[PDB]
């Protein structure tokens, strides 16, 4: 039992975009780090109805890279609008204790909104990875637009997990006008703009209770004109893709790094990469 383990997470509201050439950058492996656990969350349209038939390239390309580095894919789950994959180094796995489990929650009769939770145990400590997706317009169990449901929160369990991560587009936005938002961004006043971000409002309403976001130092990750760094001001610049963390059991989770990946420009949203060190 190591005293500590590292986790990398990435999410991207990637829409219809395809596997990039440079997956090492996407996963935070380009400076030679070797995280114990990797989670990849996507939001978009048509993943199960793989009409472009891009599923096979995703599997080939991710598998080729990660197996060579000593990872086992614990689970990939795809719905029409979400994807969640969790990888763990083979060396940490004990089949008799792993207890690998995934649930899918859907909130609407078309199965477009909800979330996915994948959980597993290593060294007798339980990890859970959540992603979620909600539309602006739906009726919800919270009567808010935010992509929260108690069923996706394993910290609310009678026996809550040791290490929990929630990654994706939480449907949290910057509640001010585009002019004022752009001005803040031009001044690099990230904390000033974050003052208008809705995560705190969701928490006042008792959603994402006790979940922590690492400090944000990067500019809003949406909405860009593709293949530029120029905001499309038809939307107020916002932080779409987020990483939250919690422990149910008093374990220390230390963010090492939290950043958008500005080199992935192909789309309106920029992926977000988080790195953590967890103490068992």
Contact between 40 and ligand HEM by CB under 6 A: the answer reads yes
Other CB atoms within a 10 A radius of the CB of residue 36 amount to: 20
- Measured CA to CA, the distance from residue 84 to residue 47 in angstroms comes to 11
> Using alpha carbons only, what angle is made at residue 87 by residues 20 and 168, rounded to the nearest 5 degrees?
60
Q: Which residue is nearest to ligand HEM (CB)?
A: 55
Residue selected from 6, 85, 155, 238 as contacting ligand HEM according to rule CB under 6 A: 85
Single out the segment in contact with ligand HEM by CB under 6 A; choices: 13-21, 142-150, 215-223, 250-258. 13-21
Contact between 29 and ligand HEM by CB under 6 A: the answer reads no
Contact between 108 and ligand HEM by CB under 6 A: the answer reads no
Q: Which long-range contacts (CB under 8 A, 24 or more apart) does 111-117 make?
A: 111/79, 111/80, 112/80, 112/81, 113/81, 113/138, 113/147, 114/79, 114/82, 114/149, 114/152, 115/82, 115/147, 115/149, 115/152, 116/77, 116/79, 116/82, 116/84, 116/152, 117/152, 117/154
Q: Is 58 annotated for ligand binding?
A: yes
- CA 258 to centroid of chain Cα atoms: 12
Contact between 70 and ligand HEM by CB under 6 A: the answer reads no
Single out the segment in contact with ligand HEM by CB under 6 A; choices: 16-24, 104-112, 158-166, 190-198. 16-24
- Measured CA to CA, the distance from residue 110 to residue 7 in angstroms comes to 33
- Measured CA to CA, the distance from residue 45 to residue 17 in angstroms comes to 10
User: One symbol per residue from 141 to 180: x for binding ligand HEM (CB under 6 A), - otherwise; what is it?
Assistant: ----------------------------------------
Single out the segment in contact with ligand HEM by CB under 6 A; choices: 70-78, 119-127, 206-214, 218-226. 70-78
What is the torsional sign of CA 203, 208, 212, 217?
Answer: negative
Q: Which is nearer to ligand HEM, 60 or 206 (CB)?
A: 60
Contact between 117 and ligand HEM by CB under 6 A: the answer reads no
Contact between 58 and ligand HEM by CB under 6 A: the answer reads yes
In the range 192-251, which residues lie near ligand HEM by CB under 6 A?
Answer: none
Single out the segment in contact with ligand HEM by CB under 6 A; choices: 46-54, 129-137, 140-148, 208-216. 46-54
Specify the pairing of strand 163-169 against strand 125-133.
parallel
Contact between 69 and ligand HEM by CB under 6 A: the answer reads no
Contact between 256 and ligand HEM by CB under 6 A: the answer reads no
- Measured CA to CA, the distance from residue 3 to residue 267 in angstroms comes to 40
Single out the segment in contact with ligand HEM by CB under 6 A; choices: 17-25, 102-110, 154-162, 180-188. 17-25
Annotated binding site: 58
Q: Which residues bind ligand HEM (CB under 6 A)?
A: 14, 16-19, 40, 42, 44, 46-47, 50, 52, 54-55, 58-59, 62-63, 73, 76, 78, 83, 85
Annotated binding site for heme: 58
């Amino acid at each position: 039992p190591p005293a500590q383990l590292s986790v990398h997470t990435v999410s991207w509201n990637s829409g219809h975009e395809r596997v990039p050439t440079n997956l090492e950058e996407l996963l935070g492996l380009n400076s030679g780090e070797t995280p114990d656990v990797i989670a990849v969350a996507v939001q978009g349209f048509g993943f199960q109805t793989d009409k472009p038939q891009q599923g096979p390239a995703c599997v080939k390309n991710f598998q080729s890279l990660l197996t060579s580095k000593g990872y086992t894919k614990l689970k990939n789950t795809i719905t029409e609008t979400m994807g969640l994959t969790v990888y763990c180094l083979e060396k940490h796995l004990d089949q008799n204790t792993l207890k690998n489990e995934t649930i899918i929650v859907t909130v609407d009769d078309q199965k477009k909104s909800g979330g996915i939770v994948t959980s597993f145990t290593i060294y007798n400590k339980r990890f859970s990875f959540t992603t979620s997706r909600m539309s602006d317009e739906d009726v919800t169990s919270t009567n808010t637009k935010y992509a929260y449901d108690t069923r996706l929160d394993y910290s609310k369990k009678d026996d809550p997990s040791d290490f929990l991560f929630w990654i994706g587009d939480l449907n949290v936005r910057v509640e001010t006008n585009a002019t004022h938002a752009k001005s803040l961004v031009d001044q690099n006043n990230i904390d000033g703009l974050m003052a208008f971000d809705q995560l705190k409002k969701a928490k006042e309403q008792k959603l994402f209770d006790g979940w922590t976001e690492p400090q944000v130092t990067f500019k809003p990750t949406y909405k860009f004109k593709p293949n530029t760094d120029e905001y499309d001001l038809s939307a107020t610049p916002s932080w779409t893709d987020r990483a939250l963390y919690k422990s149910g059991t008093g374990k220390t989770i230390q963010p090492l790094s939290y950043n958008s990946l500005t080199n992935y420009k192909q789309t309106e949203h920029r992926p977000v990469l988080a790195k953590f060190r967890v103490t068992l």
